[PDB]
Design a protein around this ligand. Structure first.
Ligand SMILES: *C(=O)[C@H](C[C@@H]1CCNC1=O)NC(=O)[C@H](Cc1cccc(F)c1)NC(=O)c1cc2ccccc2[nH]1
Ligand SMILES: *C(=O)[C@H](C[C@@H]1CCNC1=O)NC(=O)[C@H](Cc1cccc(F)c1)NC(=O)c1cc2ccccc2[nH]1
Lengths: 304, 304
């Protein structure tokens, strides 16, 4: 029993983190086979950022301008190129610790683990969701850029996020490992800001099922609702509409608990309209939306 | 910016997890140098548990009854012995991935990372506090016993927890790596139950400082309180008394924010007496007590 925000074990990713330095900027890189991936803004000066032409900036660099350090070993850079907003530094040594991996882009509402790193050294691991507005609510300081987000399936690391920047509200923005930003953000100095966000309804329902599996039942009721009536309530409280695919995805959890999805939706409607009246669910006094149905199933196996 | 429940990178511990099987029981072990540590209840049958004499049970075992598997390699057991509630299996191979390590016992109120494992394979990592009542609110299923808790300092893993059991309320109990239980729990079948718990006051104050560093200020006020008057309020709300050492430990965070510790205590008193009035702090609608002052400093460096 119990339910925690749990990250994937980070060792397979730790073995891939290196330090990349260009000029006076140091940040992190991801070393897979004979390529090190890092944010292209490593090549910028501060004044470069309010109007950078990266093609020009990169054409003025050579391999020797990039210092790559893996632990206490310098890696010789033998080529450089830019893929969208990431820099690919070819090095003369394949990482012997390269895991099986994939570069996957994730959807809003999906979760992943972040290995925060500084100076190529891992500092902490935590779980994050991609928000509907394509930001993440991370924990990142100066020097954390190039830290990555990932999921692990069997033996395979699916990398889905590289960290680039912090927005004015304190939330975070980055790219997939192809260098393509999540959301309408850019690696140049602008007034860019997070757009309006919404709550991930299917994840809240998943977490209510986690709570039932863990013995929190006080919010259940005998009522049901229709999908349409629920989604009228969702709209009013800035929750994302629930689809029939979401209902289908919640099928296993509904079967395990014996609580139909639209019955649980009637409970969520009551919670939105009434609040908790001083009670908690899984140790929270808010409705939590950063657990997917898969996160709940993986963690709550066989408690029944 | 940002503030997350962050665990330590788990790779150094992943390299130490193995599977231990005795009879029909499989659980996890910790392989350091040429010793594998695991819960001694691995040698018990189900009926053994309501009244086990472990000295007798172990005197009836031999090395060949213990199957130890590190990944896909069987480790030959060449000795066995029992230290309090842990079993030490000497194997004929030193773990080449042994980190620098220590066995440290932690205090209630301190935090650590848990690497949940099944069948010797790491599944997830999360941060936990040792509660005042010596339980932990973990996330553990059948097969998770022998999973460990730890902190990492520079290159050194301080192991502080091995998992043994789940209590009736769904919280968890275990030992230090010397096999000595945290709290008044035993590895035999009893009606044992978690005792009354309390909130870790110094950690709540630390988290309020984290919130200030991250721009949540609405709960601040111009008032101060005395330590005595605060502790009268603490007693009423089942919070642990605040000591002058706690005040001293909060000194750096107080200096960084410019908010005297007893000023922050006056804010906490107001929050306990009034609630939050629909507001949140660092994304929570409850006062959070599983971050130590060191956790906050490590994570919130230089946001100022
Ligand atoms: C990389 O290590 C670093 C991580 C930041 C630092 C603080 N917290 C984080 O997550 N990233 C930067 O320094 C980037 C660089 C950059 C990227 C894209 C466009 C840019 F103009 C600059 N800068 C920021 O994250 C940044 C800059 C400003 C200015 C004003 C308000 C907010 C803000 N965020
Ligand atoms: C080890 O893998 C396993 C981990 C448990 C399983 C469920 N969630 C966990 O964290 N631990 C056990 O099976 C232990 C064995 C044990 C240890 C000490 C004394 C014992 F009598 C048995 N058993 C339990 O955790 C347990 C047994 C019972 C019975 C009734 C109520 C609660 C309870 N917990």
């Amino acid at each position: 029993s119990g339910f925690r925000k749990m990250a994937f074990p980070s060792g397979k990713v730790e073995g891939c983190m290196v330090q990349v330095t260009c000029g006076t900027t140091t940040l992190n890189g991801l070393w897979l086979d004979d390529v090190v991936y890092c944010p292209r803004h490593v090549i910028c000066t501060s004044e470069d950022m309010l109007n950078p032409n990266y093609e020009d900036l990169l054409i003025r660099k050579s391999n020797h301008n990039f210092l790559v350090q893996a632990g206490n070993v310098q890696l010789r850079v033998i080529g450089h190129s830019m893929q969208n907003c990431v820099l690919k530094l070819k090095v003369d040594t394949a990482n012997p610790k390269t895991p099986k991996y994939k570069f996957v882009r994730i959807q809003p509402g999906q979760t992943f683990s972040v290995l925060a790193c500084y100076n190529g050294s891992p500092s902490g691991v935590y779980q994050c969701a991609m928000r509907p507005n394509f930001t993440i609510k991370g924990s990142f300081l100066n020097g954390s850029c190039g830290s990555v987000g990932f999921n692990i399936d069997y033996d395979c690391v699916s990398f889905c996020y590289m960290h680039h920047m912090e927005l004015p509200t304190g939330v975070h923005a980055g790219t997939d490992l192809e260098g393509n930003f999540y959301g309408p953000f850019v690696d140049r100095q602008t007034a860019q800001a997070a757009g309006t966000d919404t709550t991930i309804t299917v994840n809240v329902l998943a977490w209510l099922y986690a709570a039932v599996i863990n013995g929190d039942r006080w919010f259940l009721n005998r009522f049901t609702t229709t999908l349409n009536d629920f989604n009228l309530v969702a709209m009013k409280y800035n929750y994302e509409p629930l689809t029939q695919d979401h209902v289908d995805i919640l099928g296993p959890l509904s079967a395990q608990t014996g609580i139909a999805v639209l019955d649980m939706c009637a409970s969520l409607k009551e919670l939105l309209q009434n609040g908790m009246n001083g009670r908690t669910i899984l140790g929270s006094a808010l409705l939590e939306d950063e657990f997917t149905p898969f996160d709940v199933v993986r963690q709550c196996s066989g408690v029944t």
